[PDB]
Symmetry: C4
């Protein structure tokens, strides 16, 4: 706990960034006007009527920070290559996330605050079950930024072959290719596809 | 029937505890008055206003009781050990269950009573099909409390090997591991790692 | 076409009986009056305000008739036995059908008639895709009445090893049991579990 | 990029035709009154009160145009045959594209324009993830028009065999059921079943 659990939580908060921008687009009660007699009402009621865009904004900066901490593991190391023996695509495991765990929150109505406490508890419970599930690599935000999630079986030049790894890659991979690595956990590594 | 059916119903009522706490949080309609104008309006119309959180409260105590009756399985004789040959982490169930059978109830509006009778009938029909569907081990309330559901293939020192069992383990298991069992049913056993 | 398509349409109309029951429970605005002031409005207004419960009632009688036409095939030719060589329980397809194709109908609001035309078009389009989708045996109404859907490979005494058949059974089956067949199509047969 | 991406975007716009038909049926505020005092309000406010049927109409003609291009990819070539070694039906991967990605759109209320901007962003995001998701052959509009999507492993008479191809076809296929190809990408080809 407290290192692998925090890494998986930082992967999960990245997976909810599309939900936070969806709620910000959905239920922001901004007074969009261009007339002369529609002057500023003040920061007090503008903050008070826009509570859930403010909270989803703070969570969106948290998702941006965790994306930065994900790129910080491909910053440092990774001048070593392996060979893929069996690559099966698992990008659809990202998209079913967007099919199931995000669009019901589009379906709800964020008017009363008690229902918002219920939806926040649903997000927290989905996170706690999602941490310990060995499917935490599913991401709408990562798969939206060109990355593809593959199930590979790498083979090291000197150690041997390790089975059932998950490769987040920037380009397409196939059987008998040459990729780099930067291991997030003992399950997920970022590939780079040496040409 | 009966006893095995009652054990599976007791596993199913445990699977719905998060739904009952979501309905209690969602539609409570309790007077939360910080103002001095709102006094106690009376117990009778407070009970008559809150009908679905009272019923979901009673079902929540039923889920707590069935969790206690699940823990009574591992209270008694569990002092044997086996060896694990396959350890396929089928813990993604209790997350498709959560967002396919518990999340759609959160979007309904629990206002008119015929609609509540329809939702109760949906819960009953989902339960009747879920008893005999070979996937009754999926449990959001169990997977909240650290438990991981594994598809396992055990081997006994004296009898032999038995195929396709389900282990509700407390900690992570792998191939060639020693666990202590307590058999809930002929398909699902509570396992604890021996270390 | 025709006859095989009509049999698959009958199985699909059988698969939608719980939806018609749910709509009849949901949106029937019957005037349940115990008071002495609520007299009869008339049969005309009771019919005109309950149009879609009447339509779902007619479809429920069609589902009952197609259940009768399914049960007609266990009567006439069932004096032969076969042996199951590989049984895998596929009773979860019915529950995924119930949770995915019937539950989202329950959350719609059946008030404006244009929306009702849209939902009827969704039912028709789901049926047209569901006839030819190779998974037409999924059924909430059949799995409610004790039937379990299995994937078996029968062994004939003198004909061969026709594999990949779908067995609707009244009781549990495993490897090496004898079952009485009554073929519906070239894919789905009703077993009987010869003791 | 470009051309392959444009072909996959065309297949995705073909995949969404039933959604545009459903929205046009759902939220068209057309004054369907046969009364004598139901005069024309005017073209301008008829256009302004029906903005999202107009947008979904334009997208429906785009889906019709991309269906025309998919027929143009089979107009020209397609005078060579292969042999099929392993045929597995995958038409259900079409239908799960419906009930998870097109069904929950009709539960939304298309009244306020901010919510419509959110739903359009959801369509765009589902499209961006669905291009690279390796399951882009899923189709409600194609599977409506008799086409079945199979997973085949063709064998050429002179070149050899190729594994894991996806065949869109008009009639039922099996092993040793020679077909004519009209290859769209390196993954999806249109079969014709040379008798």
């Amino acid at each position: 706990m407290q290192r692998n659990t925090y890494n998986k939580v930082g992967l999960y908060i990245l997976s909810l960034a599309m939900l936070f921008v969806f709620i910000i687009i959905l239920t922001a009660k901004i007074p969009f006007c261009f007339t002369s007699d529609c002057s500023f009402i003040g920061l007090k009621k503008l903050v008070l009527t826009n509570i859930v865009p403010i909270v989803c904004f703070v969570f969106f900066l948290f998702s941006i920070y965790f994306y930065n901490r994900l790129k910080n593991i491909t910053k440092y190391n990774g001048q070593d290559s392996v060979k893929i023996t069996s690559c099966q695509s698992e990008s659809y495991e990202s998209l079913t996330f967007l099919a199931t765990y995000i669009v019901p929150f589009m379906g709800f109505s964020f008017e009363d605050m008690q229902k918002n406490i219920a939806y926040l508890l649903l997000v927290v419970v989905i996170g706690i079950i999602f941490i310990k599930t060995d499917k935490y690599y599913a991401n709408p935000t990562l798969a939206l930024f060109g990355f593809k999630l593959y199930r590979v079986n790498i083979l090291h030049p000197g150690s041997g072959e390790t089975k059932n790894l998950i490769a987040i890659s920037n380009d397409v991979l196939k059987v008998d290719d040459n990729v780099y690595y930067s291991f997030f956990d003992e399950f997920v590594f970022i590939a780079r596809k040496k040409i």
